[PDB]
Structures are given as C-alpha cells and as structure tokens.
Ligand binder design. Structure first.
Ligand code: A1IAD
Ligand code: A1IAD
Lengths: 154, 153
C-alpha cells in the first residue's frame, strides 16, 4: 500500500509542521525534539549570502537558548501550510514578529514575511530552512539599507 | 469534486512548467499565461514593498524592459511543488543572467528564488517571486551592510 503509506506520512508530518509553527515561549527550548538527531535548521537568506545552518539536534537546542534571549516574544502569524506531492516535503508561508534584542544593537521591533521549507525523515524534521528579505532585519537593527536607483526604470 | 480538482492541478502544472522554461524572445508572450487582471512581480526588494505588475497589458510591457535589463535570463534547478490547493503551486529554483540596470555597471546576477503561482480558470491570477536582495546588490556593485556577529554563538 504505497498510497496508504504516503497518506499516513503526510498527515503525521503536517501535525509536526503545525506544532513547529505554533511553538512559542518556553516551549521553544524543546522545539529541537521535532528534528532527527542529525537534523538541520536555520536561515537561508542572510547579509553574507551564505546560510546560517544549525546542524544537529544538540546545536538546535543550544540555538533555542540564544533565540529566547534575542527574540523573547517571537511569534509566527498568518500561517499557511502547503502539503506537496512529496509526503515528506512541506512549505509554509507566514509572517513573524517580535522584539529584537541583538547583541550590540539597540533594542527594537522586527517584523517580516517568511517562507519555510520542511523536509521529513521517519516522522521528524530532517531539514528546516527559512527564507526572508534581510533588508527588513537591517531596518529593525537600525542598519541603513542600500537604495537601488530606479530613475532609469519604468 | 475530486475529478475537477485533479483536472485543474494537471493543467495548472503545465502552465507553471511553461512559465519557468520561458526564455529569450518567448518572454514577450509570457503575459498570455495570466488572466486579464493577473498580477506578477517581485515581493522582496530594498524598499520593503513589492514591485507588483498589475494586469496582462502591464505584464506584457514589463517583458520589454526585462529583455533589455536581463537579456539572457534563465531559471535553473527548477523544482515544482503542487499543493493541496489545485490552484496554488510553489517553485524553488535558481536564476542567472547578465544584469544591465540603468546607470549601473553591467554585471552578472545569480540568485536563489521561490515563486508562488495562484490560478483562476486555467491561467495565472497571481505570480510572486521571493529572493535575497543582497545578491542583487552585489551584482550591481552596491555595498551590502554586514550584521555584526561577534556577540552571537
Ligand atoms: C527568530 C528568528 C528571527 C531568528 N533569526 C535567525 C535564525 C536562524 C539563524 C540566524 C538568525 C539570525 O538572526 C542571524 C544571525 C545569527 C547568527 C548566529 C547565531 O548564533 C544567531 C543568529 S547572523 C544574521 C545576519 C542577517 O543579515 C540576518 C540574520 C542573522
Ligand atoms: C529577471 C528578474 C531578476 C527581474 N527582476 C524584477 C522583476 C520584477 C520587478 C522588479 C525587478 C527588479 O529587478 C527591480 C526593480 C525594478 C523596478 C521597476 C521596473 O520597471 C523594473 C525593475 S527596482 C528593484 C530593487 C531591488 O532591490 C531589487 C530589484 C528591483
């Protein structure tokens, strides 16, 4: 029953995506338990052009300690979960917001639009990736955003 | 109900495939894949507001400018994702080509992209693309600010 197995995987994996996206507050300290032991999470859109990949369940748990300090009230909002033809691959469109308390920058408020990719193995997240426009994070940190000159464009 | 959803998804997938493969002079007719009131454009920009091109006529005009400023643009590494909504698709891909922006040195632009396609009655109602604008800054010779990471693990 290939189809039955795929349907079961997709329904379970959707519940894990829902739980990830709704993880807030102190529960963030245990979000890494939604990953495989060698699972990877992180931010694929950064200033430098290289992803910030947090590799393995142990490092993901450490990242959560940092995130609770630097993003103390972070929430995902406007959550739309997309199943796909691959029962082990989901996409999520959402927004996120909260205070930003980044080391060495003034405290501020950060709001952005996000896309997330979730790939699963044996019922847990093998790879989570998030994609956003870093210019909005620059603005939240008081960093000047470059302005493309548009005079020559329609 | 299921038969109508399956029919829609299979047809719409072919339109996404056609859109993603469109290059060269065929770009001048890509707007014909949209509804008359369809919208396309870039949702991730320096200013923080989307550049939305509204209506099939304006989309056709944009293609003229695109062939000037991105004369050889190709989408590569195309992965199409169907969803539970037969009228909504996502695409993960890369793109590459010369960038010839007015008042900037000619450059080469490469980036990773996500696209969203929503359909109505067999045609694209809304196309949106999402990327990291910092790579487009680099292709234009624009300095990218650097977030200080010393205080981070
Ligand atoms: C709740 C979310 C808004 C948290 N966000 C992140 C999530 C995952 C990875 C990195 C970040 C992040 O915020 C950035 C850096 C960072 C590096 C090391 C580290 O241990 C912690 C954070 S460096 C950098 C540069 C940018 O241009 C944008 C973001 C980040
Ligand atoms: C093949 C693709 C790489 C084409 N790309 C675009 C697609 C749709 C919309 C805008 C762009 C674009 O490239 C930007 C601007 C632009 C504005 C008006 C116009 O008629 C033509 C282009 S302004 C700006 C600022 C940025 O920071 C990044 C991109 C753009």
């Amino acid at each position: 029953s290939e189809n039955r197995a795929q349907v079961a995987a997709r329904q379970h994996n959707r519940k894990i995506v829902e739980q990830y996206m709704h993880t807030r507050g102190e529960a963030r300290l245990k979000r890494h338990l939604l990953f495989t032991e060698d699972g990877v999470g992180g931010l694929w859109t950064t200033d430098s052009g290289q992803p910030i990949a947090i590799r393995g369940r142990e490092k993901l748990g450490e990242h959560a300690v940092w995130s609770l300090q630097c993003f103390p009230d972070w929430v995902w909002t406007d959550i739309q979960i997309f199943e796909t033809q691959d029962p082990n691959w989901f996409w999520v469109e959402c927004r996120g917001e909260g205070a930003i308390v980044f080391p060495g920058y003034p405290r501020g408020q950060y709001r952005n639009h996000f896309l997330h990719s979730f790939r699963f193995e044996n019922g847990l997240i093998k790879e989570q990736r998030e994609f956003m426009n870093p210019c909005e994070q620059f603005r939240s940190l008081g960093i000047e955003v470059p302005e493309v000159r548009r005079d020559g464009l329609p």
